[PDB]
Each structure stands twice: as C-alpha cells, then as structure tokens.
Amino acid sequence: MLDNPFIGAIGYVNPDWATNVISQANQTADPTLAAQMRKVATYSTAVWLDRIAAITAGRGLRGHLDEALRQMQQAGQPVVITLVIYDLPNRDCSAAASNGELLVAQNGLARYKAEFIDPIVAILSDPRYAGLRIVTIIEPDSLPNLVTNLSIPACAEAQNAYIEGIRYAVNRLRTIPNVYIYLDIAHSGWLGWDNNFNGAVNLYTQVVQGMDQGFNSIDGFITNVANYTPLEEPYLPDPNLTIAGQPVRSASFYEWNPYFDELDYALALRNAFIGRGFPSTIGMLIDTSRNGWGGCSYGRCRPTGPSSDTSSVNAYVDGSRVDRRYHRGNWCNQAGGIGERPQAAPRSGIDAYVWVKPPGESDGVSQPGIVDPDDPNKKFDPMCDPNGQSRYNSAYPTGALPNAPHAGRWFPQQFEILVRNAYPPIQP
Ligand SMILES: [Ca+2]
Ligand SMILES: [Ca+2]
Ligand SMILES: [Ca+2]
C-alpha cells in the first residue's frame, strides 16, 4: 500500500459530471465564461454512493471503475478514483428530515451492511480493478453529530448504528489492498471550538481503536466535504490578535472558535490524532470544490488585505474574512466560488486537495411542494430557503440561492456563479 494514493496518479474524470458542464458551456453566451466552463470539465470529482440504487443506476459503480480503467490505459499511468460512501441509517440526523433511505428503527444497520456495503465491497474486490487506487470517503455528516448534536433524538438513537456501521465499512474495505480509507470529520466551523475539537478526537480515537486493524485501519481524515470553508484566511492569520481590546476570534462570525480555516483545522487534528497513537503516516484531505471565494456576493468582494476598520472586532473581521457567508453554518447553495484544483501533497500532512462535492450539483431544493420523481426521499430543508433565516442563528439569512433543484441535480445558476467566482480564477 502506498503512503499517498494521490502521488503518481491522475484523478478520475467523471464523464457524467463533465457532460453537464460541457452542456452548460454550450448554452453559455459569453465565450470567455463558456471556455472557463470547458476547462472546469477536465478536472477530477468524486463519485457519490448516496443510496443503494447508486450502485447500479446509470453506468453504476462498475461502470465508473471500468471508465477509470479506460482512462488509466489511455493515460499510461495510474488513476485514482474517489468514492463517497454515504448511506448510514438515520443519515444526516441533525436535519429535521433525512434524505437517507435507511432508518435505524427499521433494520437500517442490517440493510446498510447487506445491501449497501457488501455489494460495494464485492465490486471493489474484482481483480480487474487492482491497478487503480480507490479512495473511499467514509460517511460525511455522521460522527460529528455524536459530538455536538446528541440532544437531537435522531442522532442520539443512531449512535451505535453509526459506530458499528462505520467499523463494518472500514473493516470490509481494508480487505482490499488498493483501497485508501479516509474518515469524514466535518469542517472548522463545526468542530473547531475547544470542547468540540477534543470531543471529536476522543470519539474518532474510540471508533478507530475498535476496528480490526486498530490505528492502521484508515489512511487519514477529510474535512470540508460539500462545504465552503476556505483553506486559509490570509488576512486573519492570528485568532488571538487584539482589535479594540478583544481577540479577533471573539467576532460574531467565529463565536470564539480559534479555527478560521481548513488548513489550521486539518493539520491540528492530524497532530492531535498522532498524539493519541495514530501513526504519522496518516494524511488529511480537504474538499476544495467550492471554497475559493473569488468574485463578489453577500454584499462583499474578496478582501485584498486586513480591514482598515479597527474600530470594532466585528468590523475588522467582517472586512478581513474571505469566507463572506452571513453565518458559518450556512451550508446550502451558497454563492461561493470554485477553490484550488485537485492536487497531491500541497502541504506536509495534507495528502491532497480534492473535489468531493462536484461543483454545479445542488445542495437541495429551494422550496417545499416539489417532489423529485427519481427519489421521493429527498426533502426540502429550510436552510435552502432563499427567503428564510438560519436555523442555527435566526438573526441571519440562509444565503441560499433561489431556483435550486433537488440535491445532486444540476444547478446551472450556481454553477455559473461558482465558475465566475473561482479562486484562483479559471483559465480557459
Ligand atoms: Ca499515508
Ligand atoms: Ca447482499
Ligand atoms: Ca490560518
């Protein structure tokens, strides 16, 4: 097994995603923007397995792997393909409504094992795929809920199913020598606060210790999956900097969380885990699909330096931060921009920047009353209401873009915004 599966391999390019990008480019009048979109279509994105049907629907898992083989033959070098394993029972428990098809109280764990993990493992075990590097991102929005959201019944009731399900997934995937396993661990705006950070380190250490190969059962962790938090806040590098008598982390946007960005957070987690007994061979991934924050939205353009307004900590932070969301918890259909392109080993301790969430795919439908004919499990979430307030702090708007289709479906208005706001900007 390699120390870093992203070194010496090219990323899988999903033709089904690229087809959507190119279709929009062909319908885009501005020749420069259209050319930028065509360039975007050449980049590598992860394949999401978000329900049992996803295993065989369309080209299916085998189809993507066969396509990866073709790209590998064509390129004359290894291909690394990223798969998102995302179907735990009581999935996304902190939402009032789960889009997940499996329920803990109705044989969810057992079905997760037999009908989701098992057939995935059988396909990945096919000797035909031995030449690939297969990266599996394990269950976004699962374990972090057990740190912060146990007050929510759906989360508290799912605890042991999450633990046993993730252990089962990793234990089975570890039997396949070219599978590289990264556990999802949210983002800095979720687990950055001291109590959450320590709670997460404790929890993930317990979860991994109980796996068959203990601390050797995984290859590392991933942050920022499907979120927008920047890699770096270059103009807020010191969370303890005093402005008007107070440290900048005390700003309303941060609420005393000292982690303003994903590099600080991912590297701190990695060091903490190594301190708990994980081998230094672990590496972190960060999803940079939508965290560039170029262009302008939410009443601001990207800052080009620390704010000149040192009159209050809020004025300073709000004028200095690259993440210009109204509130850090605003996760749905944000007017952000594409971030750093997928790349291997950008920093010591970081295995790669990856595009896990595929840019252009919706985070959720923007209003209730509309049922997805292909998945009646997908349900409107008020965080996606362009006219609504955040459920985490009602003083702030959701920031969600209007006219969004159901989650996973192509959202051309956001895709155009994501390309225009790319940082670094897309070059045709
Ligand atoms: Ca490694
Ligand atoms: Ca089965
Ligand atoms: Ca920083």
Single-letter amino acid code for the residue at 212? D
Assess contact for 351 and 341: CB atoms under 8 A: no
Closest ligand to C-alpha of residue 52 is 2
Ligand 3 centroid – CA 324 distance (Å): 16
List, by residue number, the catalytic residues.
Answer: 141, 363
Ligand 3 centroid – CA 256 distance (Å): 15
Three-state secondary structure call for residue 207 = helix
Ligand 3 centroid – CA 318 distance (Å): 16
Domain containing residue 117: 1-428
Q: Which residues contact 183 (CB under 8 A, 6 or more apart)?
A: 138, 139, 143, 166, 170, 204, 207, 208, 218, 220, 221, 222
Closest by Cα among 205, 370, 224 to 285: 224
Ligand 2 centroid – CA 115 distance (Å): 5
CATH classification of the domain holding 104: 3.20.20.40
Q: Which residues contact 69 (CB under 8 A, 6 or more apart)?
A: 79, 128, 129, 131, 132
Assess contact for 317 and 303: CB atoms under 8 A: no
Assess contact for 345 and 7: CB atoms under 8 A: yes
Closest ligand to C-alpha of residue 270 is 1
The Cα 59–Cα 250 span in angstroms is 49
Buried/exposed 321-347: b ≥16 CB within 10 Å, e otherwise: bbbbbbbbbbbbbbbbbbbbbbebebe
Closest ligand to C-alpha of residue 235 is 3
Single-letter amino acid code for the residue at 80? V
**For residue 276, how far is the Cα from the chain centroid?**
25
Three-state secondary structure call for residue 344 = strand
| Angle at CA of residue 354, ends 350 and 355, nearest 5° | 155
Residue 48 pairs in a beta bridge with: 84
The Cα 223–Cα 67 span in angstroms is 27
Method by which the coordinates were obtained: X-ray
The Cα 379–Cα 42 span in angstroms is 32
Query: In the chain, how many domains are there?
Result: 1
